[PDB]
Amino acid sequence: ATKAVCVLKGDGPVQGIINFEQKESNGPVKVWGSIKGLTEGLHGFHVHEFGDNTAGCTSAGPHFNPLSRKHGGPKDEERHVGDLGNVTADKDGVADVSIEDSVISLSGDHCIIGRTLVVHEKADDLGKGGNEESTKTGNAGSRLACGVIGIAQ
Amino acid sequence: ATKAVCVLKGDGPVQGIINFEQKESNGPVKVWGSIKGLTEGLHGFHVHEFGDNTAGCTSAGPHFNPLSRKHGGPKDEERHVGDLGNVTADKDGVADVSIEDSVISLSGDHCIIGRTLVVHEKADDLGKGGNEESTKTGNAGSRLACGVIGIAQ
Ligand SMILES: [Cu+2]
Ligand SMILES: [Zn+2]
Ligand SMILES: [Zn+2]
Ligand SMILES: [Zn+2]
User: Which residues are annotated as modified residue Phosphoserine in the UniProt record (chains A, B)?
Assistant: First the structure.
């Protein structure tokens, strides 16, 4: 009963469509879709703070982090709201995304509408990498594609 | 949010960046920026309902109209929330946009974050066209460029 969508675009072409559905405001968000053009393996997948793509994906700023916590994986209590972990691409470069997440929302203060979804070059280390960057970004490298999350029918 | 931004893109030469700022809750929204690639003259300018660009600008749906009103211009009481009138391009194809609007908002029920800004082929007739489409769409013709309105820093 609330729906959102994001068209991911980046050089490659890396491209995909990601859908979001939340049946009630107190429930989880289902995230699903497909991304093509990726190298085989895990790729970091995050909601970033700003829905600003004026200079490409860099303009999206840091991870969406309304509670000012450290970076983690989606299962961790200490995580950014935008920490959705990794997506996995197969040998053909396609990632079939299927996530349920209870921390993001399509309404209220953890709302991700109007923010940027980003898929990364490298895997997110989920804050377990033991360098400074691990608990900020997860070391997921460059931003390969992004889009602004919009309200859907 | 107090600031928002939209990058307008389409299949042709029309592109631009539009900024939004609302200093006070329920206060006016300043709308400003530049659009290039346009034919000289007026071009309709609207917020459409969905932030869905999966098949380009057509996917954005109808005018944003939460109050179930007829189509009008920005200075009319009878208007859709998304009715921002026309932008004017010069011979070089550049429209410098500078609007203040108090019907749109960057929060609450009239919030435009996560919806689509669209610039059109033709002028919007502001509901004065005397055909049935005038009070629905304004007869502004094709959608030349669009983008999702995102949260800005
Ligand atoms: Cu329009
Ligand atoms: Zn990221
Ligand atoms: Zn993070
Ligand atoms: Zn209208």
Answer: 98, 102, 105, 107
CA–CA gap between residue A6 and residue A18 (Å, rounded): 5
Structural domain spans, chain B: 1-153
Tell me the CA–centroid distance for residue A12 and ligand 3, in Å.
25
**B108 C-alpha to ligand 4 centroid (Å):** 19
Resolution in A: 1.2
Count CA atoms within 13 Å of residue B46 on its CB side: 36
| Burial of A153 (C-beta count, 10 Å sphere; 0-12/13-18/19+) | exposed
The helix (H) or strand (E) run that includes residue A4 is strand A2-10
Q: Which residues partner with A10 through β-bridges?
A: A14
Indicate yes or no: CB of B52 within 8 angstroms of CB of A152: yes
Rounded Cα–Cα distance for residues A46 and A58 (Å): 13
DSSP B89: E
Q: Which of B17, B53, B151 sits opposite A51 (nearest CB)?
A: B151
CB atoms within 10 A of CB B134: 18
Q: Give residue for tokens 């600031």.
A: B3
- Count CB neighbours of A112 within 10 A: 28
> What is the CATH architecture assignment of B1-153?
Sandwich (2.60)
Residue with tokens 């290039």: B36
Nearest CA in chain B to A56: B7
Give the separation between CA A11 and CA B93, rounded to whole angstroms: 28
- Alpha-carbon distance of B5 to B18, in angstroms, equals 6
